[PDB]
């Protein structure tokens, strides 16, 4: 009876056509992913705005059941390991200090990284790899800038987080360094912020409270490794997908070269197109019974939400599986809904905007150095993108 999930696959890039056809020809499925119990899988805009938007669907039971997912280990760390009110106490806090203004006040250093990453490319000669020489190297530097970390240790962090990244190639002898020294260095820096507050993100996170609650050393060390390793994974891979789209679409590479003022509308339309790697948000449980499309959801039963496919619903968007960058204003679902969203987007807006901007400011002659399919791919089993991306100018 159940169907085998994922319907997307680690070797691909768009929303898999059998996924976008079962969103029309079976609009809610029973699924077995590769790890966890059986689940329902929800596909349509107003069904996923519905199941990630009523207070009897929640994450909290995932903490005592083996949860329906695409990878072997359980969700143990960071806010998606957590449930209300205990999640609300954490999210009310991180939204006061992970601000959209501070994201804005990073764009001058993220461009100054970015222009320097194209100056060192230029000085290295061609072909170059644009993931190793750009999409891997823009987050970790901005993200260490955002924490107020000295430049001379951004080298370690690349190599540190890189030995935990699926989008990078460092050995377990560096995980052996990273596990020994990196949590200790952020502790060393968290202790600095307790000692003396400063304009950095860690400082705001020792000063900000939810009502009068304090984010403790372990809580701020946890968030921060997840930012500098998970969020890093996320924006490296999202950038290498996107700038591999700029390498392979020549009419848009000339369109943005022609109209840099259109770049935020293309980022927003590329954002409304995001199939969210595997196609779904992690599993929520109905804590009491609830009917949906004439079939009963049971007390204590898991629903997956296909948010990346529901960002591509033909009955929400025109030709919804494709892009049209002439669409504006725009709105989107490939990041979750109501209290069930990703944290990152105010940062990843500045990355996604800078990362198209200053490439076409600084070396717009750039293109893909190969026959256009002949790359090596990122297979970590939540997100999809290239591992290497050759380029010539
Ligand atoms: C395949 C992509 C993921 O790769 C991974 O999930 C990589 C995980 C590696 C194998 C980590 O191993 C264990 O991961 C568990 C999820 C948590 C566990 N601790 C933290 C409780 C951890 O020991 C190790 C070796 C690396 C450390 C630094 C780690 O926690 C890294 C997480 C990286 C997450 C990557 C990004 O995905 C994030 O996965 C989480 C399970 C989600 O809850 C969400 O996190 C915000 C998702 O974001 C896209
Ligand atoms: C670059 C694009 C990004 C992508 C593709 C991505 C993707 C993911 C996914 C698939 C989830 C789980 C969705 C769910 O089931 O709720 C998630 C949640 C989350 N991500 Fe993102 N993310 C991105 C950027 C960021 C950044 C930059 C950060 C660093 C601050 C971050 C932090 C988180 C956190 C903390 C959660 C849990 C949210 C909560 O439940 O409160 N992400 N991410």
XYZ file of C-alpha atoms and ligand atoms in Angstrom:
485
model
C 0.000 0.000 0.000
C 2.522 2.861 0.885
C 4.710 4.536 -1.788
C 8.544 4.764 -1.678
C 9.835 8.273 -0.810
C 11.824 10.364 -1.888
C 10.176 11.002 -5.311
C 13.093 13.556 -5.980
C 16.583 12.022 -5.954
C 20.174 13.011 -5.075
C 21.116 12.914 -8.810
C 18.826 15.647 -10.106
C 17.936 19.325 -10.151
C 14.295 20.187 -10.800
C 11.163 18.815 -9.053
C 10.990 15.191 -10.355
C 8.092 14.955 -12.926
C 6.462 11.890 -11.185
C 6.385 14.107 -8.050
C 4.675 16.974 -9.861
C 2.337 14.469 -11.558
C 1.297 12.687 -8.256
C 0.628 16.157 -6.755
C -2.100 16.212 -9.540
C -3.069 12.417 -9.805
C -2.731 11.486 -6.134
C -2.918 14.754 -4.251
C -2.305 13.133 -0.791
C -0.141 9.876 -0.537
C 0.925 7.278 2.029
C 4.736 7.197 1.995
C 7.646 5.200 3.428
C 10.771 7.220 3.419
C 14.069 5.259 3.844
C 14.242 5.952 7.664
C 11.229 6.187 10.115
C 7.503 5.124 10.252
C 4.911 5.410 7.505
C 3.414 8.809 6.713
C 0.951 10.841 4.741
C 2.494 13.173 2.119
C 0.742 16.461 1.427
C 1.433 18.332 -1.955
C -1.066 21.226 -2.595
C -0.675 24.980 -1.523
C -3.800 25.273 0.600
C -3.403 21.758 2.075
C 0.153 22.504 3.266
C -0.857 26.020 4.520
C -3.540 23.946 6.268
C -1.492 21.118 7.883
C 1.477 23.499 8.839
C -1.091 25.987 10.252
C -3.440 24.452 12.863
C -2.345 23.901 16.431
C -3.155 20.093 16.509
C -0.383 19.325 14.048
C 3.004 19.684 15.809
C 6.545 18.318 15.869
C 6.649 17.200 19.583
C 6.026 13.346 19.363
C 9.225 13.068 16.986
C 11.191 13.078 20.302
C 9.969 9.440 21.209
C 9.414 7.925 17.768
C 11.766 7.039 14.898
C 10.860 9.913 12.515
C 9.970 9.712 8.826
C 13.091 11.158 7.079
C 15.700 10.688 4.234
C 18.855 10.118 6.404
C 19.920 7.494 8.988
C 20.377 9.713 12.102
C 17.567 11.289 14.119
C 16.903 15.140 14.263
C 18.772 15.759 17.565
C 20.273 19.324 17.292
C 19.013 22.869 16.591
C 15.503 24.173 16.852
C 13.923 21.383 14.692
C 14.835 19.077 17.541
C 12.287 21.005 19.692
C 8.543 21.747 20.279
C 6.223 24.543 21.824
C 6.255 26.166 24.266
C 9.980 25.208 24.466
C 10.540 25.996 20.761
C 8.625 29.279 20.916
C 10.951 30.329 23.911
C 13.907 29.680 21.634
C 12.483 31.251 18.339
C 11.079 34.467 20.117
C 14.749 34.936 21.306
C 16.796 34.146 17.987
C 14.466 36.423 15.871
C 15.441 39.518 18.053
C 19.191 39.087 17.385
C 19.430 37.211 13.930
C 17.989 40.438 12.451
C 17.167 41.592 8.907
C 18.882 44.965 9.582
C 22.123 43.249 10.651
C 21.779 41.160 7.428
C 21.582 44.507 5.553
C 24.650 45.803 7.557
C 26.662 42.769 6.228
C 26.118 43.435 2.445
C 29.299 45.938 2.293
C 31.663 43.084 3.714
C 29.841 40.318 1.793
C 30.466 42.338 -1.473
C 34.004 43.048 -0.265
C 34.450 39.362 0.191
C 32.756 38.761 -3.110
C 34.932 41.268 -5.181
C 38.078 39.785 -3.515
C 36.890 36.112 -4.323
C 36.663 37.301 -8.144
C 40.065 39.239 -7.822
C 41.727 35.821 -6.506
C 39.829 33.897 -9.217
C 41.087 36.301 -11.863
C 44.669 36.038 -10.496
C 44.417 32.176 -10.436
C 43.594 31.888 -14.317
C 41.203 29.578 -16.041
C 39.363 27.198 -15.854
C 38.452 27.675 -12.181
C 35.884 25.828 -9.956
C 33.153 28.315 -8.983
C 31.964 26.218 -5.969
C 35.378 25.875 -4.411
C 36.520 29.351 -5.467
C 33.121 31.100 -4.859
C 29.905 29.247 -3.500
C 31.987 27.468 -0.660
C 33.920 30.620 0.294
C 31.342 33.419 0.371
C 29.106 32.052 3.284
C 31.840 30.987 5.708
C 33.536 34.423 5.519
C 30.324 36.526 5.747
C 28.968 34.151 8.451
C 32.255 34.640 10.470
C 31.962 38.320 9.921
C 28.395 38.204 11.319
C 29.780 36.571 14.518
C 32.709 39.154 14.806
C 35.386 36.382 14.406
C 38.999 37.335 13.550
C 39.953 36.858 9.815
C 42.897 34.625 10.570
C 40.559 31.979 12.031
C 38.070 32.083 9.044
C 40.678 29.743 7.456
C 40.152 27.134 10.202
C 36.356 27.396 10.020
C 36.249 26.773 6.255
C 38.309 23.603 6.789
C 36.410 22.724 9.997
C 32.813 23.087 8.822
C 34.136 21.685 5.454
C 35.013 18.388 7.055
C 31.325 18.093 8.277
C 29.899 19.488 4.839
C 28.609 17.347 2.141
C 29.346 20.345 -0.281
C 33.090 20.240 0.617
C 35.988 17.746 0.658
C 38.065 17.742 3.976
C 39.165 14.595 5.934
C 38.117 13.068 9.270
C 41.535 14.295 10.752
C 40.003 17.727 10.466
C 36.764 16.593 12.195
C 39.160 15.337 14.895
C 40.600 18.930 14.970
C 37.080 20.526 14.766
C 35.584 18.469 17.567
C 38.598 19.219 19.819
C 39.141 22.942 19.071
C 36.068 24.574 17.345
C 33.419 24.255 20.008
C 36.108 25.408 22.386
C 36.925 28.497 20.307
C 33.224 29.507 20.158
C 33.079 29.032 23.894
C 36.184 31.150 24.225
C 34.210 33.779 22.077
C 30.887 33.425 23.872
C 32.875 33.985 27.155
C 34.297 37.254 25.445
C 30.701 38.422 24.833
C 29.732 37.762 28.427
C 32.892 39.617 29.536
C 32.296 42.625 27.092
C 29.146 43.122 24.702
C 29.950 44.244 21.114
C 28.003 44.777 17.841
C 28.382 41.121 16.665
C 25.536 38.429 16.528
C 26.838 36.436 19.575
C 26.724 39.639 21.677
C 23.089 40.338 20.782
C 22.355 36.669 21.686
C 23.863 37.018 25.211
C 21.964 40.374 25.633
C 18.570 39.566 24.010
C 15.917 37.701 26.081
C 12.551 36.212 25.462
C 10.550 38.234 28.045
C 13.337 37.783 30.783
C 14.652 34.221 29.639
C 18.345 33.875 28.663
C 19.845 31.861 25.897
C 22.632 29.895 27.788
C 26.162 29.073 26.681
C 25.151 25.583 25.443
C 22.090 27.073 23.639
C 24.161 29.731 21.860
C 27.102 27.266 21.141
C 24.386 24.845 19.636
C 22.734 27.564 17.467
C 26.081 28.900 16.351
C 27.679 25.472 15.161
C 24.319 24.835 13.294
C 24.662 28.323 11.699
C 28.316 27.945 10.835
C 27.856 24.268 9.657
C 24.211 23.589 8.760
C 23.293 27.085 7.518
C 26.715 26.987 5.690
C 25.748 23.681 4.085
C 22.413 25.205 3.131
C 23.751 28.440 1.456
C 26.765 26.761 -0.129
C 24.452 24.267 -1.763
C 21.652 26.815 -2.587
C 24.344 29.157 -4.120
C 25.907 26.270 -6.211
C 22.447 25.320 -7.585
C 21.631 29.013 -8.315
C 25.112 29.997 -9.901
C 25.126 26.792 -11.779
C 21.678 28.145 -13.138
C 23.467 31.501 -14.018
C 26.248 29.290 -15.790
C 23.739 27.348 -17.834
C 21.063 30.166 -18.716
C 22.585 32.685 -21.155
C 19.482 34.799 -21.858
C 19.136 35.450 -18.080
C 22.946 35.990 -17.665
C 22.552 38.790 -20.203
C 19.219 39.933 -18.675
C 20.676 40.596 -15.197
C 23.963 41.862 -16.787
C 21.610 44.359 -18.710
C 19.293 45.112 -15.599
C 20.908 44.554 -12.193
C 17.698 46.133 -10.683
C 15.776 42.916 -11.746
C 18.160 40.699 -9.625
C 15.901 40.754 -6.454
C 12.835 39.778 -8.603
C 14.897 36.888 -10.101
C 16.129 35.799 -6.681
C 12.354 35.957 -5.415
C 11.188 33.947 -8.562
C 14.162 31.461 -8.099
C 12.948 31.399 -4.488
C 9.249 30.577 -5.556
C 10.852 27.789 -7.760
C 13.073 26.069 -5.078
C 11.910 22.277 -5.049
C 13.588 22.083 -1.550
C 16.022 19.303 -2.571
C 14.062 16.245 -1.592
C 10.544 18.002 -1.858
C 9.257 18.138 1.731
C 9.439 19.775 5.149
C 10.271 17.323 8.011
C 7.390 15.322 9.599
C 4.640 16.944 11.864
C 2.153 14.650 13.864
C -1.623 15.195 14.153
C -2.133 14.873 17.949
C -5.821 13.987 17.572
C -7.892 12.806 14.477
C -8.610 15.116 11.422
C -10.048 14.381 7.819
C -8.416 15.744 4.719
C -9.452 15.066 1.017
C -11.963 12.410 2.282
C -9.386 10.329 4.217
C -8.893 10.410 7.999
C -5.626 11.496 9.632
C -5.334 9.573 13.051
C -4.361 10.663 16.564
C -0.520 10.386 16.714
C -0.006 9.988 12.948
C 2.755 11.703 10.787
C 2.294 14.097 7.888
C 5.059 15.258 5.667
C 4.549 18.598 3.891
C 5.934 18.811 0.350
C 6.725 22.475 0.615
C 9.177 22.680 -2.333
C 6.561 21.015 -4.624
C 3.816 23.099 -3.122
C 6.011 26.175 -4.110
C 5.359 24.712 -7.775
C 1.622 23.949 -7.565
C 0.134 24.566 -11.016
C -3.139 25.469 -9.215
C -1.292 28.191 -7.248
C 1.258 29.443 -10.093
C 1.194 29.630 -13.977
C 3.621 27.088 -15.523
C 4.692 26.659 -11.978
C 7.421 24.004 -12.550
C 9.377 26.634 -14.677
C 10.620 30.126 -13.860
C 9.344 33.407 -15.204
C 11.588 36.334 -13.711
C 9.094 38.978 -15.099
C 6.717 38.009 -12.097
C 6.523 40.756 -9.440
C 5.374 41.178 -6.665
C 6.033 37.519 -5.706
C 5.213 35.025 -2.843
C 6.414 31.549 -2.138
C 6.204 28.309 0.058
C 9.534 26.475 -0.371
C 10.660 27.444 3.185
C 7.708 26.405 5.390
C 4.576 28.226 6.791
C 3.019 29.741 9.980
C 5.271 28.435 12.961
C 6.917 25.809 10.769
C 9.646 27.629 8.816
C 13.294 27.809 8.381
C 15.179 30.644 10.356
C 17.776 31.623 7.774
C 16.114 33.645 4.988
C 17.051 37.230 6.015
C 20.763 36.079 5.759
C 20.308 34.071 2.634
C 18.697 37.001 0.858
C 21.973 38.919 1.204
C 24.069 35.988 -0.003
C 21.721 35.146 -3.014
C 21.595 38.814 -3.862
C 25.431 39.526 -3.501
C 26.368 36.239 -5.157
C 24.685 37.219 -8.569
C 25.502 40.863 -8.134
C 29.275 41.187 -7.777
C 30.083 38.207 -10.195
C 28.412 40.171 -13.052
C 29.992 43.414 -11.747
C 33.465 41.999 -11.623
C 33.848 39.264 -14.322
C 30.525 38.978 -16.331
C 32.567 37.221 -19.214
C 32.269 34.008 -17.066
C 30.615 30.669 -18.454
C 30.670 26.984 -17.981
C 33.966 25.206 -18.985
C 32.388 21.795 -20.041
C 29.603 20.120 -21.999
C 26.794 21.395 -19.895
C 25.809 18.112 -18.031
C 29.393 16.922 -17.279
C 29.716 17.821 -13.535
C 30.174 16.025 -10.163
C 27.140 16.213 -7.832
C 26.409 16.835 -4.031
C 24.729 13.675 -2.563
C 24.159 14.383 1.232
C 20.455 13.350 1.191
C 18.692 16.561 2.073
C 19.774 19.222 -0.485
C 20.839 19.045 -4.163
C 23.539 20.953 -6.179
C 27.001 20.562 -7.985
C 30.194 19.687 -6.023
C 32.458 21.121 -8.674
C 31.520 23.770 -11.312
C 34.241 24.571 -13.973
C 34.367 28.006 -15.548
C 36.175 29.978 -18.248
C 35.979 33.721 -19.464
C 22.351 16.494 4.627
C 22.409 17.975 5.144
C 22.620 17.900 6.677
O 23.752 17.044 6.980
C 23.570 16.401 8.237
O 22.514 16.289 8.787
C 24.800 15.956 8.852
C 24.841 15.398 10.036
C 26.160 14.924 10.571
C 26.250 13.473 10.206
C 26.250 15.262 12.113
O 25.803 14.097 12.801
C 24.690 14.287 13.634
O 23.553 14.984 12.998
C 22.319 14.987 13.689
C 21.282 15.658 12.885
C 22.529 15.794 14.940
C 23.803 15.284 15.759
N 24.059 16.247 16.935
C 24.339 17.591 16.513
C 22.934 16.164 17.874
C 25.033 15.127 14.899
O 26.148 14.552 15.680
C 27.698 15.646 12.436
C 28.814 14.660 12.012
C 28.014 17.104 12.125
C 27.418 18.145 13.101
C 28.314 19.377 13.063
C 25.952 18.460 12.742
O 25.074 18.485 13.651
C 25.605 18.884 11.349
C 24.458 19.117 10.733
C 24.301 19.409 9.305
C 23.078 19.392 8.677
C 22.868 19.343 7.211
C 21.789 20.375 6.876
O 20.518 19.811 7.066
C 19.868 20.119 8.364
O 19.584 18.840 8.938
C 18.939 18.743 10.248
C 18.697 17.261 10.664
C 17.593 19.574 10.147
O 16.972 19.526 11.402
C 17.816 20.999 9.537
O 18.757 21.760 10.370
C 18.535 23.197 10.464
C 18.442 20.816 8.117
O 18.677 22.108 7.467
C 18.680 22.050 6.072
C 20.241 28.697 2.093
C 18.987 28.261 2.158
C 18.380 27.392 3.162
C 17.761 26.246 2.959
C 17.587 25.599 1.612
C 17.356 25.636 4.200
C 16.619 24.453 4.366
C 16.167 23.959 5.655
C 15.197 22.871 5.815
C 14.855 21.783 4.695
C 14.696 23.019 7.042
C 13.625 22.247 7.664
C 12.154 22.709 7.274
C 11.062 22.111 8.259
O 10.712 20.946 8.183
O 10.685 22.966 9.111
C 15.352 24.124 7.666
C 15.066 24.577 8.962
C 15.945 25.457 9.610
N 17.021 26.123 9.060
Fe 17.226 26.508 7.123
N 17.728 26.572 5.216
C 18.404 27.525 4.565
C 19.077 28.605 5.211
C 19.278 28.713 6.599
C 20.258 29.513 7.351
C 21.219 30.418 6.648
C 20.244 29.196 8.695
C 21.131 29.800 9.761
C 20.646 30.684 10.669
C 19.238 28.141 8.850
C 18.716 27.607 10.023
C 17.648 26.791 10.114
C 16.994 26.468 11.331
C 17.416 26.916 12.729
C 15.937 25.665 11.022
C 14.848 25.196 12.025
C 13.763 26.257 12.120
C 12.800 26.102 13.300
O 12.128 25.098 13.306
O 12.680 27.040 14.123
N 18.732 27.847 7.600
N 16.307 24.662 6.862
